[PDB]
A paper describes a structure:
The APL1 proteins contain a signal peptide, a leucine-rich repeat (LRR) domain and a cysteine-rich region followed by a C-terminal coiled-coil (CC) domain containing a helix-loop-helix (HLH) motif. [name] and APL1A—C are members of an LRR family, the LRIM family, that includes several dozen genes found within, but not outside, mosquito genomes (family Culicidae) and are believed to play multiple roles within the innate immune system. The APL1 genes are homologous in sequence, polymorphic and under positive selection pressure. Structural analysis of [name] identified that the protein exists as a homodimer that is mediated by a unique N-terminus which has no homology to other LRIM family members.
To determine the molecular basis of [name]-LRR homodimerization, we crystallized [name]-LRR and solved the structure to 1.74 Å resolution. The refined model contains two molecules of [name]-LRR in the asymmetric unit, residues 25–364 for chain A and residues 27–364 for chain B (the crystallized protein comprises [name] 21–370 and a C-terminal 6×His tag). Of the three predicted N-linked glycosylation sites (Asn166, Asn211, Asn317) a single N-acetylglucosamine was resolved for residue Asn166 of each domain. The overall structure of [name]-LRR is similar to [name]-LRR (Cα rmsd 0.605 Å). However, [name] has two fewer LRRs than [name] so the overall length of its LRR domain is ~70 Å versus ~80 Å for [name]. A homodimeric interface exists between the two [name]-LRR domains in the asymmetric unit that buries an area of ~1500 Å2 representing 9–10% of total solvent-accessible surface area. The two N-terminal helices form a dovetail joint between the solenoid LRRs that hold the two domains at a 90° angle to each other. Residues 31–44 form an amphipathic α-helix such that Leu35, Leu38, Leu39, and Phe42 pack against the first LRR, protecting the hydrophobic surface from the solvent. Interestingly, a short, well resolved β-strand on the N-terminal loop of one domain (Met28–Leu30) forms a parallel β-sheet with a β-strand on the first LRR of the second domain (Ile55–Ile58).
Numbering used by the authors:
A (entry chain B): 27 to 263, 270 to 337, 342 to 364
B (entry chain A): 25 to 364
């Protein structure tokens, strides 16, 4: 997000004047000649976003050796020419989000050994081997058709949400910190042992039926864990956020103070009957609705430790602080 | 917006325009706020492109610094209104595009000073008010995909697209220049307003709420070639007058038509006539060789009438067929009909 002022315009204009930054965004470009950039050796940043480009021609980037940033998001690309980045070894950021790409062949980023930010969200990708790009720092491949996620050695933030991923592979990665995998087809979490630096992990809307606590024993930094909308049935356990909402949970045990640093705990839409929570000053937010509470257990929870409520209780159950519960 | 080829020539011409700071491309730069004095040191700008940003407001005097402005493109931003005086100091403006914002209204004084404004693109906003008739310089106008209920047509617009609104009233001065009028997907129930547009060549009234078409409304048409009125609620048509000799396309499909009456030679110059998806039982044509495509399926044909129709029309002109027929109907050259 930029603020347009005489100062920021002047800087933009300076970069244009020298042809170091070329803005071709939003010009309804549909076709590009092979030699369009034949005499544009000065170009370091090339912006071609929000056009209607169907194809990139052979050798299109053969004469732009200083290229570091290339933005081609919001076009109609479905594949890439041979050796597209062969002559752009300085490339640090590349976006082709919102195209129609189907595969990224494995040789694509072989010469781009400084590529650190790669944006490929909202394509039709069935194959991209990110593990072959060990320079990656931030990556987004969300909203594609990937079934296998290969994670490179030192990526720090990776969003692969909204795919059909059921396999995660790649070398141990102590730097991966934010991992977004919501809306996928994951049924196991053993791969979590390879990512000891994780702070935020979202595994919501997957096909998890159990979450075994020994997959988390190498975690040095984990603060936020989202596992809503899976099919978890029971849980028997630096964490600040824990989302267990919308599962099939019959019980959740925690032994015991390891829930004391929690500020956000979501238990709503499960089948929980009892739940213990010590006097944790402070817990910021707690959801309990749409469960099967025993009234005694529910009461004790309000003495020690709400942001939701029940509307209609079923037979045998009555409202108690806005939540349904059954008497002993 | 028309598409371009990026060639050494077109890139050279672009770079030359950029070099002189006569064309400024700020498209796609995630611009959110703009300071009133943003263009204080850029008085040379004639074409200003700020499409595909996230601009929420324009300062009222932001364009005082660009008095040579002829083209302004602000498509795909987040504007909900224009402030008073926004174009007061831009008299040379000829094209203004602001499609795909959230504009609710254009106030009547917005274009007072822009007396050369010819091309106006406001499609895909939420407009409930824009008085285009105040802007007589308009030549090409697009206000499609809005919430307009009244359409004031300016005096000399040549092409106007107001499709996908909720228009039930058309008004404004007699306009003999209007050639292409797109009004499909609206709420029209009458066509008396057609009398004020004698230059019309192509008119699309499909997906409206027309139950009748009064043939007299077309008596002043000098050059009408294509008339689309599909997907209305038409039940009966009687086209009796002098034919429109220029008319070559007539789309009456997907109505509720029981008949289309006409004098013997009415349709002799049509090339394309679409009657499919109605309730037509009998229909007549003369033996004209001009017809290229005729659609007849999904009706309620009397076999004798249908067979009389094939005897007069050339074999290849029928380009549709029924698949299965209801009880007591059978296929005749691929079309269902019932014997008398
Ligand atoms: C990865 O890319 C996706 C898709 O562009 C991002 O999702 C969009 O995020 C913005 C801002 O949060 C939302 O306004 C959009 O609605 C989202 N788009 C879609 C299609 O859902 C996502 O934010 C990116 N991931 C990261 C970590 O930045
Ligand atoms: C008026 O503007 C609209 C923009 O909505 C144009 O509609 C687009 O037409 C193109 C084909 O030319 C299609 O690719 C898009 O799907 C249409 N857009 C939408 C939102 O449906 C329309 O063509 C313009 N009218 C004229 C006569 O040019
Ligand atoms: Cl980022
Ligand atoms: Cl004004
Ligand atoms: Na890690």
């Amino acid at each position: 997000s930029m603020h347009l002022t005489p100062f920021t315009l002047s800087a933009l204009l300076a970069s244009f004047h020298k042809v170091e930054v070329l803005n071709l965004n939003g010009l309804q470009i549909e076709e590009i000649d092979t030699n369009a950039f034949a005499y544009a050796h000065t170009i370091q940043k090339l912006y071609m976003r929000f056009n209607v480009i169907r194809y990139l021609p052979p050798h299109v980037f053969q004469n732009v050796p200083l290229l570091t940033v290339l933005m081609l998001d919001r076009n109609d690309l479905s594949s890439l020419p041979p050796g597209i980045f062969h002559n752009t070894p300085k490339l640090t950021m590349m976006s082709m989000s919102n195209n129609n790409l189907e595969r990224i062949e494995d040789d694509t980023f072989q010469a781009t050994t400084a590529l650190q930010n790669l944006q490929l969200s909202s394509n039709r990708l069935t194959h991209v081997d990110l593990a072959l790009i060990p320079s990656l720092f931030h990556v987004n491949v969300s909203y594609n058709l990937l079934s296998t996620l290969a994670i490179p050695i030192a990526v720090e933030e990776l969003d692969a949400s909204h795919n059909t991923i059921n396999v995660v592979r790649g070398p141990v990665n102590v730097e991966l910190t934010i991992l977004k995998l919501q809306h996928n087809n994951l049924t196991d979490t053993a791969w979590l042992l390879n990512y000891p630096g994780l702070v935020d992990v979202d595994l919501s809307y997957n096909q998890l039926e159990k979450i075994t606590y020994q997959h988390f024993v190498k975690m040095q930094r984990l603060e936020r864990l989202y596992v809503s909308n899976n099919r978890l049935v029971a849980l028997d356990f630096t964490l600040k956020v824990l989302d267990l909402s919308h599962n099939h949970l019959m019980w959740v045990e925690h032994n015991q103070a390891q829930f004391d640093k929690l500020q956000y705990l979501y238990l709503d839409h499960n089948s929980i009957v009892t739940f213990k929570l010590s006097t944790s000053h402070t817990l910021k937010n707690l959801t309990l609705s749409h469960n099967d509470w025993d009234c005694n257990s529910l009461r004790a929870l309000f003495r020690n430790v709400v942001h939701d409520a029940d509307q209609h209780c079923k037979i045998d159950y009555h409202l108690e602080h806005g939540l349904c519960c059954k008497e002993s």
